[PDB]
Design a protein around this nucleic acid. Structure first.
Ligand SMILES: [Zn+2]
Lengths: 53, 317, 120
RNA sequence: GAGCGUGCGGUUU
RNA sequence: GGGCCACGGAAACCGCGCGCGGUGAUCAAUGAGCCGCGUUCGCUCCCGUGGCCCACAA
């Protein structure tokens, strides 16, 4: 997967730093998902910690 | 970078007095989470891999739903905006499917071409194109980046336009040939990449947060009011005394209009909103915005699809 | 840096960590790749989990930490996944690693495992 | 049943 | 009669694609190949059955 996007500016790019903002870019395509969601249980534990008690 | 969805509409006033009674109806941010869902739409960021049909199937089984229809079918390998209309709001996809779409595409050239040619030539593809046999519109094309043989670009198109094919014809116009190695849809009608564009992961999680952990916030932000699926349509706002009539299949007569968008033409698809900005129903205009404004009687909108329940507003008539 | 990275690892320790793995590849047993590594933890055969700090998307390894804390298994981070794939016996980048049996990295792991109890 | 949305294709009353 | 709403206009095997479990590989460990198992949304016209209203907004 090659298309990336600035998380600050929203700009699409193939580079690793925003040609516009200068921030680190990320893959544009979302994580692949499964209905079996094997690690769903633990992903939510990580995620609840992020969002707050 | 302008799709028809984007055109600016001025709001004209017909009856300054009209007020809406707060006992009646449910404005989108006043709907119990349960009803918010019944009349909700998901701005989904489809992952790569699955067919769009399978995706919505995972959603119905995980959210425990009995109906849900996505708009324009994204191909398996393609990611990005896939609007999923829920339960009682399912039929709004009919405002979507026709609406313009935008994609970001990665095209791979089979041969070397100067950065100038590529741009010049891609500019020639705006306007109309034929594919299969059908003709379809390319609204704009913007090159973002060229790294040697790889060309990254945004494109805006009429509904039903085949990007893979366009990139093919570009390759042909350039000589060296081309194929599309990656595609992502960043817009479909009113649905854009913003804080409302949720991945499957965030979604099925936020659901469990509400259902199992009793937190609403996050899951409520994941569902949008059906009214969102209508932002791009011309609207006419109607009086309280006219709302119940319309949900019972009454065409909308002029005297029941409060405000309307400018530049509506006979034949145009319009959305019919209450003064609380709730979606009542979709319809076909039988008058221009000017006729409606001046006239005192007559049918202004053939009501064709009703979404609001008949018990939200009292049968005033 | 990422949100699954739940604490700070010093150049010395992180380096003492890539050496750790490098050893068990031949004197003992290890497993590479998030799947093999996750499976190891759910089995309690993982004496030490090593995760990389540059995994995009995060959903690929986000689960590992909460997983390790549940099965009481020590986990540790390393600057890059390329160099982690390298020091495991492969030529492709590896997002994470387990150490099934230390072999000759025993006192090197205990070192690691006991100084990550601090940063919790 | 005829269309639409880029996605489905082949068997059997 | 008309408008609107609900339901119906097929089911069962099979396949590419995708994934999960197991295995875990000489540039796919963000998962090869081998095995097993999963796995496909709706809308518009029109037609039929049923329900609710017939409402120029006072
Ligand atoms: Zn930017």
């Amino acid at each position: 997967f090659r298309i990336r996007k600035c998380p600050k500016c929203g700009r699409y790019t193939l580079k690793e730093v925003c040609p516009v903002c200068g921030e680190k870019t990320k893959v544009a395509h979302p994580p692949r998902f499964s209905p079996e969601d094997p690690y769903g249980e633990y992903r939510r534990r990580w995620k609840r910690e992020v969002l707050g008690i | 970078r302008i799709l028809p969805a984007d055109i600016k509409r001025e709001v004209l006033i017909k009856d300054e007095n009209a007020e809406t009674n707060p006992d009646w109806g449910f404005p989108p941010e006043k709907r119990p989470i349960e009803m918010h869902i019944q009349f909700g739409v998901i701005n989904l960021d489809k992952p790569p891999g699955p067919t769009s049909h399978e995706v919505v199937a995972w959603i119905k089984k995980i959210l425990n739903l009995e109906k849900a229809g996505h708009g324009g079918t994204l191909d398996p390998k393609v990611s990005g905006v896939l609007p999923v209309a829920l339960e009682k709001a399912t039929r709004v996809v009919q405002a979507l499917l026709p609406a313009g779409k935008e994609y970001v595409a990665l095209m791979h050239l089979h041969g070397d071409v100067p950065e100038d040619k590529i741009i010049q030539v891609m500019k020639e593809f705006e306007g109309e194109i034929i594919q299969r046999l059908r003709t379809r519109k390319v609204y704009y094309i913007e090159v973002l980046e060229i790294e040697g043989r790889d060309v990254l670009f945004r494109v805006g198109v009429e509904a039903g336009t085949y990007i893979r094919s366009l990139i093919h014809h570009i390759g042909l116009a350039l000589g060296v040939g081309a194929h599309m190695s990656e595609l992502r849809r960043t817009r479909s009608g009113p649905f854009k990449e913003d804080e409302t564009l949720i991945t499957l992961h965030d979604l099925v999680d936020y659901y469990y947060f509400w259902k199992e952990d009793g937190i609403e916030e996050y899951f409520r932000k994941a569902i949008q009011p059906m009214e969102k699926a209508v932002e791009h349509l011309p609207k006419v706002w109607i009086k309280d005394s006219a709302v119940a009539a319309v949900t019972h299949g009454a065409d909308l007569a002029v005297p029941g209009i409060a405000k309307l968008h400018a530049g509506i033409k006979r034949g145009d698809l319009v959305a019919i909103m209450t003064l609380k900005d709730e979606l009542v129903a979709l319809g076909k205009a039988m008058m221009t915005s000017q006729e409606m404004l001046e006239k005192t009687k007559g049918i202004a909108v053939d009501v064709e699809k009703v979404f609001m329940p008949r018990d939200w507003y009292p049968k005033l008539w | 840096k990422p949100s699954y990275v739940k604490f700070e690892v010093p150049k010395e320790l992180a380096e003492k960590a890539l050496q750790a793995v490098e050893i068990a590849r031949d004197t003992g047993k290890i497993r590479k790749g998030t799947n093999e590594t996750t499976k190891a933890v759910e089995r309690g055969q993982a004496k030490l989990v090593i995760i990389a700090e540059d995994v995009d998307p995060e959903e690929i390894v986000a689960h590992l930490p909460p997983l390790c804390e549940e099965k009481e298994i020590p986990y540790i981070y390393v600057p890059s996944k390329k160099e982690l794939g390298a020091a495991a016996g492969i030529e492709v980048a590896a997002a994470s690693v387990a150490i099934i049996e230390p072999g000759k990295a025993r006192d090197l792991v205990e070192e690691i495992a006991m100084k990550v109890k601090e940063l919790m």
